Design a binder for this molecule. Structure first.
Ligand SMILES: CCCCCCCCOCCOCCOCCOCCO
Ligand SMILES: CCCCCCCCOCCOCCOCCOCCO
Ligand SMILES: CCCCCCCCOCCOCCOCCOCCO
Ligand SMILES: CCCCCCCCOCCOCCOCCOCCO
Ligand SMILES: CCCCCCCCOCCOCCOCCOCCO
Ligand SMILES: CCCCCCCCOCCOCCOCCOCCO
Ligand SMILES: CCCCCCCCOCCOCCOCCOCCO
Ligand SMILES: CCCCCCCCOCCOCCOCCOCCO
Length: 322
């Protein structure tokens, strides 16, 4: 990106402007959900064995801090402190969409993929890696979080596995009205999760599969909910500038009361790159059934718990990068 400074030190000014139109079943078109941002990333190498990083990223709305990081890289790994995305969000899984996928990735149900005071660790060797994180609860003002993932690449097959636990002692589930007493439903909820992923590259094709489990339990309550999830997705480079993509996502939710639900999400889309600094995309999404909540990494959208009936959805977008 825009190198302001460069030597043993570099200062990089970077960002994205986005314009996105969303057409959701039974709604008027929405313009302006596009997640634009701008930041600065400063790096300095002290020697062969030690480097420092300072990064800050703001949303372009009014303006507010998205990430704010101090980093220390050493021969025994990299340690990063401050307001960061979760390690679970960085590793992600087999969702290749720009708008509607991610329903089978179950790490974000409570956290929305962010904790304002974390320490994150990364170790890399050859093709092999370890990534971990911990969130400081601040005498209960912030959630509890602890995560660990490992992965490697063996020829054309890349694999990873891991997970964690995320606790929110006062999570807002929703609201109830009984006569004229309207009241918030809040609970002490823990989300415990684990996943395995494989991604296979063959020529112009990429195919991925992710399995996820999660367990939601409530501290002073017999209620437990288990989720079992599969995501099957791929991409295909049909020309130098042009990539097609598609996925199928199925999730079953089972409560210890015996209540069962499930949800299906299918997407198909196309990406076109004008240049390294410009691209556009268009996507169709078909949803049926239930989600307890998910995050689409591509667009940064959060979808709260919901049920839909045979819903047809479309998105179109364009981005500028520097
Ligand atoms: O995450 C922060 C940067 O990580 C650099 C190395 O990533 C290697 C493996 O990546 C796959 C899981 O993200
Ligand atoms: C191969 C070891 C399996 C480890 C399972 C840990 C599961 C923790 O529960 C998360 C999903 O529920
Ligand atoms: C006991 C925990 C061990 C988990 C580590 C990885 C297990 C092997 O992973 C291979 C990656 O598989 C991705 C998931 O689905 C593969 C099943 O489908 C095979 C046909 O595509
Ligand atoms: C490892 C590659 C898997 C191939 C895709 C199938 C995944 C389907 O999940 C099994 C659980 O299904 C229960 C409901 O299935 C409804 C009809 O499914 C259409 C098959 O894609
Ligand atoms: C699904 C739309 C894909 C358009 C890809 C362009 C590939 C160039 O070959 C001829 C296109 O004919 C349409
Ligand atoms: C030249 C034949 C090689 C066979 C590669 C597999 C083709 C099947 O598609 C793989 C992934 O497709 C993504 C679909 O996107 C639309
Ligand atoms: O709010 C509606 C947003 O719709 C997005 C697409 O459908 C996602 C819901 O599907 C998950 C349940 O199957
Ligand atoms: C594979 O491509 C998936 C979409 O990734 C680009 C999305 O980037 C944006 C984060 O808000």
């Amino acid at each position: 990106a825009e190198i302001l400074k460069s030597d043993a030190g570099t200062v990089d000014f970077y960002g994205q402007l986005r314009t996105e139109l969303k057409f959701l079943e039974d709604k008027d078109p929405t313009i302006g959900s596009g997640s634009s941002r701008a930041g600065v990333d400063a790096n300095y190498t002290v020697n062969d064995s030690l480097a420092l990083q300072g990064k800050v990223e703001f949303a372009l709305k009014d303006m507010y801090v998205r990430n704010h990081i101090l980093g220390v890289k050493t021969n025994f790994g990299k340690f990063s402190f401050g307001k960061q995305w979760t390690t679970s969000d960085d590793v992600y899984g087999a969702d290749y969409s720009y708008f509607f996928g991610g329903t089978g990735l179950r790490y974000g149900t409570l956290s929305d993929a962010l904790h304002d005071s974390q320490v994150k660790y990364v170790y890399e060797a050859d093709s092999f890696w370890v990534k971990a994180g911990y969130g400081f609860p601040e005498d209960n003002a912030k959630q509890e979080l602890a995560e660990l993932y490992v992965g490697a690449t063996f020829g054309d097959l890349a694999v990873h596995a891991g997970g964690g636990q995320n606790r929110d002692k006062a999570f807002k589930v929703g609201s109830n009205t009984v006569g004229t007493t309207t009241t918030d439903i809040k609970a002490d909820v823990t989300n415990s999760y684990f996943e395995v992923t494989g991604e296979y590259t063959i020529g112009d094709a990429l195919i991925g599969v992710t399995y996820y489990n999660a367990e939601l339990d409530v501290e002073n309550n017999p209620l437990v909910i288990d989720e079992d999830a599969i995501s099957v997705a791929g991409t295909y480079k049909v020309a130098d500038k042009t990539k097609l993509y598609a996925g199928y996502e199925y999730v079953m939710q089972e409560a210890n009361t015996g209540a069962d639900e499930d949800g299906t999400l299918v997407y198909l889309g196309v990406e076109y790159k004008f240049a390294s600094w410009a691209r556009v995309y268009a996507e169709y999404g078909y949803g049926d059934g239930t989600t307890l909540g998910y995050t689409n990494k591509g667009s940064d959208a959060e979808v709260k718990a919901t049920k839909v009936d045979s819903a047809n959805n479309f998105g179109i977008g364009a981005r500028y990068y520097w």
